[PDB]
Design a binder for this molecule. Structure first.
Ligand SMILES: c1ccc(Cc2c[nH]c3ncc(-c4cnn(C5CCNCC5)c4)cc23)cc1
Length: 279
């Protein structure tokens, strides 16, 4: 660690959590191993307030080159915070640690699929509006997510949705062993991603919300999706999805990227749909 470049060490000081400020429960994993090496932890802020956090161990990092790159991703991610985006609490330098807020309800897809939970149509549109707000923020920063889906959004104790799976929180489902159906048509054809291809993914995420986590295009092979979309076939209107909300989804799947709504337009249109419900 003494081999680290000093101007880079100075640069990362506002992101670094001192080892005396973090208590990691290496004996308690979060999510039964489904999210890899992530543990319960306790972060002590400057005032001594105890913060329940999720601590990911980055075992895939060994050399000083990978360590430096990890410090930079930390510096960049610390500048991203919004109520609807998973916010980095900090980093710790065993293996390097990524400290994230604790999300009581885990991923959005498993929450809406859980038979014991009963989110209303209002609550579901509300989750889609929160995702649109988080994406509007990421898009304003010229950030292209590339993997927006309900599995990649987290839900906290106050039912606030956090767009995740970016920066140091990427490869969320990295399991140790012993997304073509969300992609825009041009991304399937050219392998190039833009904010307008994230708008497409957003439309598929809206459809996941309104069907309470059903898998998209279950009868279509991942190889056959391109042709299916070129024929002008699209995901159908879910049973209890309001028509103006389905109109919004169809706009997200326009074959011409330039004709799709912006995330700013999506927040505007969805906020007005959301306001029609009693609460
Ligand atoms: C890297 C990047 C992002 C993560 C995601 C993550 C960050 N903070 C979390 N806080 C809690 C949980 C989580 C997982 N499952 N659960 C619950 C679900 C309801 N039943 C009890 C368990 C909570 C996940 C995360 C991980 C690694």
């Amino acid at each position: 660690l003494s081999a680290l470049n000093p101007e880079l060490v100075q640069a990362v000081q506002h992101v670094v959590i001192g080892p005396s400020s973090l208590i990691v429960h290496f004996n308690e994993v979060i999510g039964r191993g489904h999210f890899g090496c992530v543990y319960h932890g306790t972060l002590l802020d400057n005032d001594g307030k105890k913060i329940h956090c999720a601590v990911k161990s980055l075992n895939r990092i060994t050399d000083i080159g990978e360590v430096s790159q990890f410090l930079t991703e930390g510096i960049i991610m610390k500048d991203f915070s919004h109520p609807n985006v998973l916010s980095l609490l900090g980093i710790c330098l065993g293996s390097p640690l990524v400290v994230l807020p604790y999300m009581k309800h885990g991923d959005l897809r498993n929450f809406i699929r859980n038979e014991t939970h009963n989110p209303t149509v209002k609550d579901l549109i509300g989750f889609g509006l929160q995702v649109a707000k988080g994406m509007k923020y990421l898009a304003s920063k010229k950030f292209v997510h590339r993997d927006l889906a309900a599995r990649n959004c987290m839900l906290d104790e106050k039912f606030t949705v956090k767009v995740a799976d970016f920066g140091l929180a990427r490869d969320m489902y990295d399991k140790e062993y012993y997304p073509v159906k969300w992609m825009a048509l041009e991304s399937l054809q050219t392998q190039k991603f833009t904010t307008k291809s994230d708008v497409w993914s957003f439309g598929v995420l809206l459809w996941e919300l309104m069907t309470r986590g059903a898998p998209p295009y279950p009868d279509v092979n991942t190889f056959d999706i391109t042709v299916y979309l070129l024929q002008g076939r699209r995901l159908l209107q879910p049973e209890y999805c309001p028509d103006p909300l389905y109109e919004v989804m169809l706009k997200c799947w326009h074959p011409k990227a330039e004709m799709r709504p912006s995330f700013s337009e999506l927040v505007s249109r969805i906020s007005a749909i959301f306001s029609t419900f009693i609460g």
